[PDB]
Ligand binder design. Structure first.
Ligand code: A1LYF
Ligand code: A1LYF
Ligand code: A1LYF
Ligand code: A1LYF
Ligand code: DST
Ligand code: DST
Ligand code: DST
Ligand code: DST
Lengths: 410, 410, 410, 410
């Protein structure tokens, strides 16, 4: 019997050819990932139909021979920034994928700031699951962190120098229950540039506004104190920081503060992991043990093409709970420019150490079926992009990000 | 969680508005029928996507306020001729539905004979399940029984008087396995009219051609002998007869000869059931017991609107096996112009007598959910159209046909 | 040879059935109007393709039997608020039409404020004519007068009582040169309600902001003085006022302040026409002569259905020039609930008095061909909606608005 | 102002991505050709909308990187076999284009013979211009010359060895009046192969059938006599012959018999031009003078890549008139594998000799704008495919065929 993506691509009508190309590229990947996780055929159908109706129409142009049609400049290759499978204890695995919503004419004089794509995506997604998307947090943070179209157009000279004029990124957690949780990431770089204000200060002022406007405890003291220090700024690129929240009931949602850091040593990794020792506990220690393990497993190996390793690029988030003052970190090792073989082997060794044999097989299956380049090309550099590490009191929490449009790069 | 047809209508893109209207009308019905049978959500998705891609684009215009857009004249209301659920022993239930493939411009000077709709439908269906549709029998019988476009256009004056210029009807058995078996019905009335030849003779000459060209035993002696008799012609409308075959491997397919008969008594029913006593056996006797039961259960009641019952309209088929000389009948009681309440009650009493309680509940559920008019309007005349009765050696075989576009008539 | 709308509807593919229905209704009307004006076939093709790509996808649902699908509440019937032909001296005639951009799911929990429709329309329109749409004025006035989605959702309780939650209306002047000038109307009623601020004050503060931010003289002293008076408020509904500007180069654009007034006498008409005598000159006098002529020609006749005339509903604008302190009025007689025969006859008598015989014939032709109900039904109340009167130094300036979806009401 | 194809591609919605790609390739070419001829913008719009609705959906897959999606094998590159501009005396120029209608799944088990594409194209074309397409001749010749799907499938083993299983080709004359005359070409090679019958005999038996069935004089004596001779068969490939007729009123239509011949000398050219001297007159002499001129102008030059010229590939038709016994020839010099520069220069010298300066400029303009490769690449071999020469009593009749998808080959 045909797999859901085969049959769907055979039947589905596509409003645009770019949607058909994006489907051909991604539906195999997303469906193979869901199927290896264990999603049910009806759930695969629902989620692939979501990807067809809400998402792909908001992926933007499909890159051609020379990528002449990609008018929306970005460091990331066109398409989903990632397609990830989270792995937790108890054979828990959830498929999720992130997209920067891009319009068909973003970057051009008609949509120079790509304002409508994310809103269209959210509208479609709420129409497909009425009641699943709550815009309370989005409605509070969109004026504070994001720059609407009119503002960006009036204040263009202030942001025209910026290469990636990103203002809102959307991730869709794709639950085994066919429910899609929308997550919104706001990089306020445009906001800071227009207002000429510290990133830290505007982000945390927005969080505090939401605190007082909602009555929810989002403890941001430690994060602000650490991120304001000068030592942190030596390594921490704050121009690359962004805020995230789940588009749910604020009492059931979260606030996460992300930032980028190019560090050289594990002590700087701990600087970003524990907020200068401010955060403490057994979970911090265990998570950093796992982080050091994967550090010396991945960044120990030689870089492709005999290029020396200047420094280890990492991202980091700190997750604030609405119920409690808890701040919990999640470290993201960037492995885009590394051997997919070494990344895969490090993941496998980590899972094997954690006793996650089923996750080992799921990961190998997803790599083999959805990412054939990894085995076909020993020198592959286009599948994995990030390895997230966290240790919740449930246990380890490791997500493995992958470029779902690696077929385009190979 | 939404039902497959809700979600699909929310996501699916439709090439034409008529397809959207037909979907709104039928997908509820077809999906409720499949779901009450027990089809799996993935199977419902696949079958509704088939109905979206292959079928509905070949249903023709959707009837408007005044049915001004129905340029393809037909006795049947626009849409599927039926949407049926077969009921056999052992809680066996299969959903199937019949369509006369109509084009968007059938009946107009561009498609005055509606030649391409059925071929397009078969092409799409084979593209969606390559290897499921075998055209051996279709390729043999299409020149013999059906009239292509060029012929009909050259020989128009011979057939212009005909009201329903039907030449090929397509039924889709919708298996629980997501496989759709295509069945083709050929009314050669146009063929006979152009060639000025007996219906009986051309149909059975085609069957005999196929016999000698295939080496398969399709015993048509008894059927021909009975249908040639003059007594039969007093009741039997032969202008309304047609041939059917399953579009499968001829060694795994069948040949069925249908005809219409307006009879008054059960002895004429037996005339058509047993081919003037030529067919015999316990199955014939039991099947006719069931037929007489439903005869005196349905045609005993008074007709709606105090209109007297002139005669009992029936159809009948005789099924020839490729493996054996067997001829087996299937009698179709026409109950389109009768109280849907009385038809439903007769079905329920029949099933209860057969011990088919589960089928009783399935039938009541399908009526309540997919056909609300039956309970809302005591004087309903727009749900049921046919009751097929047969007795295979497996046991009783009762199909219950229903106008799936009854929402349009009420 | 077929007319452009016939052929186009025959060839064009429509993304949705509602677009096909809207086309069937409006393309005849718009095309007949353009053709009676004298637009060239290529211009008709271009403008109807604009109406197909940019507009109709932003008209919203097509009203069904019971208008159950119109989830966006509005006093106006669904569709274009008007389809107008302006008539000036020298046989100058320009086709234009106004639309309140509505989304497919406006009024529902997904788009409770209809935020994206107007922006999508402008985006498409700029993509179709890059460089024709300038958003300087839109970018300045959108935050001041319009309420974005997040704000409206946070401040819902303040505006939930409002029936027509309109915030931006788009008119497309459809030039004989195939160029479409976009005009944006901002009713800040939601803005005033959320901020609990005077309509007059916020509108004119926005205008003054634009003055100081642009260096363009938009004299709003007389308008503000008149509209602030208490006598004016006795007749003037200020809850119904709105601002308009042409989406062009601000030095080549305009600012117009509209308001609604239910007056009884011609002295109140002059109150609104001359801003309490503040505006003066020969043009004012001549324009008011024409206004009184049409007043006593139209509002003199009896209302349909023997309903007595409580008061004469009028709208009024005052047009400020970027080049000069000029304020010029345009009075809009509302004739929606009046005999289309009497309105047509008044228009004809006016044109005949002005010597506009060619416009008389153009108007009669448009009425006969695009609005057959006017002749078919003597008691017609569904074609004309407004009669605008102005007297520029060029000469008289009379626009005649018509419900282009009158086919739906009759 | 944008050109019709620019604006149309900006607005039009495309049912499939292949249609969008084909549009991007061809609409520029077709529109530039029409515009250089002098077609009016409304006519360009109508004809490009025809190419969008009827044709491109019946061009088949768009060739990808490796032409893996071209499942319908053919000697010709995918797309229109040609896009031609006929040039006659008096600055008379018409654009016409030929297409072999291919389905989206032609060559696959679903449409192994590509049966529905041509019929769909004719249906759409008649729907767009009801009364323009007359199927009398098509209805007579389709059973005689063409092989339907069922026959080809039953008789597959007889034709499976054939590489190009072509059975019907459609050309659209695109008149300056926006009317599209459909022309159907029937290569009966499949018919002859299945029936194992001479091409000559079946073609001319069909023509004679039509004669007796219509009362129209189609003199085929000379053509049959010549084509039956053995000397002709030494050069004449009869496996490559085909019949053509205009899909109009038979009394206003024509019958043309085409064949392919690989000849070496001008005396063989005259053999095919005059039917072994059977045809005579001043027109024959003048036409052959022009043919010899272009022979020694084009085939005199060296072949690209230093490949020696084995023989001169030509096609030839003989046009029979329904009104008269006239047989008139049209010789087609095949110049696909020759320098587009030399072909263009020969065309220019010919036109200059004929006094057709305006045609010279039209041809150079079409080459420069629609075929930039000719000037950009001196060694171009992908623009011109045929040069037709005829001499009607009106005067010379020279058509210049060009691969409209040359952008794909370069
Ligand atoms: C796109 C960037 C401007 C910005 N920075 C990131 O690296 C990022 C990636 C990401 C991966 N999964 C979720 N978000 N998110 C952002 O918002
Ligand atoms: C449509 C008629 C011309 C013709 N006669 C019928 O009554 C018929 C109905 C049917 C119901 N289920 C399957 N076939 N089939 C036919 O071919
Ligand atoms: C409530 C709104 C519809 C608001 N009110 C109006 O009467 C109006 C109509 C209109 C006709 N032509 C142009 N505008 N414009 C608006 O913005
Ligand atoms: C496609 C071939 C099977 C066959 N042979 C040809 O060369 C031909 C080309 C053509 C150019 N313009 C019109 N016809 N036509 C045919 O039917
Ligand atoms: C890997 C990057 C840069 C972003 C991470 S977002 P996430 O997807 O890690 O969020 P969760 O906390 O896993 O929901
Ligand atoms: C009820 C009518 C008129 C047609 C019957 S066809 P069928 O659907 O009975 O065929 P099967 O023998 O059930 O496959
Ligand atoms: C008739 C109503 C209510 C609105 C008028 S807008 P307009 O269309 O009169 O604008 P112009 O000044 O004619 O451009
Ligand atoms: C040259 C190719 C091979 C076929 C020629 S068809 P045609 O376009 O020349 O037909 P006309 O006689 O020009 O109508």
């Amino acid at each position: 019997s045909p797999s859901p993506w085969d049959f769907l691509g055979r039947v589905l009508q596509f409003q645009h050819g770019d949607h058909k190309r994006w489907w051909d590229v991604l539906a195999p990947v997303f469906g193979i990932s869901m199927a290896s996780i264990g999603y049910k055929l009806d759930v695969q159908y629902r989620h692939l139909l979501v990807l067809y109706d809400a998402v792909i129409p908001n992926m933007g142009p499909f890159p051609n021979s020379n990528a002449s049609n990609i008018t929306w400049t970005s460091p990331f290759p066109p398409g989903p920034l990632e397609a990830s499978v989270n792995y937790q204890a108890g054979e828990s695995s959830m498929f999720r994928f992130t997209i920067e919503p891009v319009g068909p004419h973003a970057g051009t004089p008609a949509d120079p700031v790509n304002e409508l794509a994310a809103k269209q995506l959210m509208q479609r997604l709420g129409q497909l699951q009425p009641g699943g998307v709550d815009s309370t947090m989005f409605d509070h943070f969109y004026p504070l962190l994001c720059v609407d179209g009119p503002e960006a157009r009036r204040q263009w000279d202030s942001i025209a120098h910026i290469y990636h004029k990103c203002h809102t990124v959307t991730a869709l957690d794709m639950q085994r229950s066919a429910a899609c949780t929308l997550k919104t990431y706001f990089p306020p770089l445009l906001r800071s540039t227009i207002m000429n204000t510290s990133m830290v200060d505007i982000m945390f002022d927005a969080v505090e506004s939401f605190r007082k406007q909602s009555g929810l405890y989002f403890d941001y003291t430690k994060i602000k104190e650490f991120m304001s220090e000068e030592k942190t700024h030596e390594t921490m690129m704050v121009d690359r920081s962004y805020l995230s929240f789940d588009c749910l009931d604020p009492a059931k949602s979260r606030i996460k503060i992300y930032t980028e850091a190019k560090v050289k040593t594990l002590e700087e990794a701990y600087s970003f992991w524990s907020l200068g020792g401010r955060l403490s506990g057994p979970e911090i220690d265990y998570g950093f043990k796992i982080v050091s393990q994967m550090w010396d497993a991945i960044y120990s190996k030689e870089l492709p093409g005999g290029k020396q390793r200047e420094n280890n690029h990492i991202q980091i988030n700190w997750e604030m709970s609405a119920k409690d003052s808890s701040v919990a970190p999640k470290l993201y090792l960037t492995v885009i420019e590394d051997y997919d073989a070494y990344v895969s082997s490090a993941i496998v060794d980590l899972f094997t150490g954690l006793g996650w044999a089923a996750h080992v097989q799921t990961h190998k299956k997803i790599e083999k079926e959805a990412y054939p380049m990894c085995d076909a090309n020993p020198q592959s550099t286009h599948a994995y992009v990030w390895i997230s590490l966290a240790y919740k009191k449930t246990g380890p929490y490791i997500t493995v990000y992958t470029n779902p449009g690696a077929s385009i790069l190979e």
